[PDB]
Paper text:
Protein kinase CK2 (former name: casein kinase 2), a serine/threonine kinase of the CMGC subgroup of eukaryotic protein kinases (EPKs), is involved in cellular key processes like cell cycle progression, evasion of apoptosis and DNA damage repair. Structurally CK2 predominantly occurs as a heterotetrameric complex with a central dimer of non-catalytic subunits (CK2β) to which two catalytic subunits (CK2α) are attached. For the catalytic subunit in humans and other vertebrates, two paralogous isoforms exist. They are typically denoted as CK2α and CK2α′ and have highly similar sequences with exception of their completely unrelated C-terminal segments.
Residue numbers in the entry: 2 to 335
Write the structure that this text describes.
């Protein structure tokens, strides 16, 4: 009949136990400031519905980042603001500093702490084995925190991880697709970016949870240790699942589809084929072997699972042997 329901393994009911105001972002009241407190310096980039600038706060002469919002869906503005406010001060989460509107155009804009960034298309080429572990651990702190706060990021990818490599500091940005987890809710599956979409999104299983972010993180890890960007390189959403099935195999895929009684789109009927689950040594060569270890492969394998329930949680991930050296060095504070 219908799809089998599902619930997050961790942090299942945390929003239910909050006051309504925590997650009911539609009724949040915004105190809009004056963008004239800020002078734009230069354009830094763009989002799917935003343009991002370096700016100067002319009151205290501090450098900030201004994100001007022009979304197709409007209530998305209060959602992002409310999620950013709930998460403010959490480890490795971008800090929302102010919320303003241009006095003329009335266009809303978010003001953030400034962070430097090197584009991952030139930074990841220089990361050592240790650096990958260190920064993966920093991302996991951010994800464990926001999951523990009842929030799925739903857009984890290199472009959304700002790294100041000189100061070894990392921030997870762009919370515009983030959402509150509520058990039993059916979410939009047209989230995240193609190369980082979890199988639940590709097969249209809507009752997903925080474990979506852990798939995306596994895609990032695979591209870093194997030096293959992206790791799953699909032409479209349907071929994206084919690329995954050629690596993880079709047996576990059809068991997953069976377990949740998922109705598979007929387009997949003639393109998934039959594929074995490949051993990870198949992707190791002389150019990436210094980043690959038994610990790295054991950790990666535990993130990239079809069944979202069987993926590591962020906190389970942080206890994996792959991070023992980072944990020990963090304790002695170095
Ligand atoms: C120094 C350089 C070149 C980049 C640092 O870019 C920062 C720094 C602090 C804070 C943020 C960004 C940023 C944000 C956002 C984006 N970017 C960048 C990637 C343009 C892209 C769109 C979505 C979004 O939200 C954001 O909140
Ligand atoms: Na983005």
């Amino acid at each position: 009949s219908g799809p089998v329901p599902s619930r997050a393994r961790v942090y299942t009911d945390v929003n239910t136990h909050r006051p309504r105001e925590y997650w009911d972002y539609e009724s949040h009241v915004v105190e809009w400031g004056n963008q004239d407190d800020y002078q734009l310096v230069r354009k830094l980039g763009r989002g799917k519905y935003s343009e991002v600038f370096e700016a100067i706060n002319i009151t205290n002469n501090e450098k900030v980042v201004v994100k001007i919002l022009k979304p197709v869906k409007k209530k998305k503005i209060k959602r992002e603001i409310k999620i950013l406010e709930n998460l403010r001060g959490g480890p490795n989460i971008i800090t929302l500093a102010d919320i303003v509107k241009d006095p003329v155009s009335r266009t809303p804009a978010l003001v953030f702490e400034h962070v430097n960034n090197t584009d991952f298309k030139q930074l990841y080429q220089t990361l050592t084995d240790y650096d990958i572990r260190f920064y993966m651990y920093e991302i996991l702190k951010a994800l464990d925190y926001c999951h523990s706060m009842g929030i799925m990021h739903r857009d984890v990818k290199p472009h959304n991880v700002m790294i100041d490599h000189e100061h070894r500091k990392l921030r997870l940005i762009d919370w515009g697709l983030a959402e509150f987890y509520h058990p039993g809710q059916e979410y939009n599956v047209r989230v995240a970016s193609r190369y980082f979409k979890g199988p639940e999104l590709l097969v249209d299983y809507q009752m997903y949870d925080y474990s979506l972010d852990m798939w995306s993180l596994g895609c990032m890890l695979a591209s870093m240790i194997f030096r293959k960007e992206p790791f799953f390189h699909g032409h479209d959403n349907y071929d994206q699942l084919v690329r995954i099935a050629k690596v993880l195999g079709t047996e576990d895929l059809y068991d997953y589809i069976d377990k949740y009684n998922i109705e598979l789109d007929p387009r997949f009927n003639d393109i998934l084929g039959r594929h074995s689950r490949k051993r990870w040594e198949r992707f190791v060569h002389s150019e990436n072997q210094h980043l690959v270890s038994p610990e790295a492969l054991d950790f990666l394998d535990k993130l990239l699972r079809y069944d979202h329930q069987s993926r590591l949680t962020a906190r389970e991930a942080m206890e994996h042997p792959y991070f023992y050296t980072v944990v020990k060095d963090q304790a002695r504070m170095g």
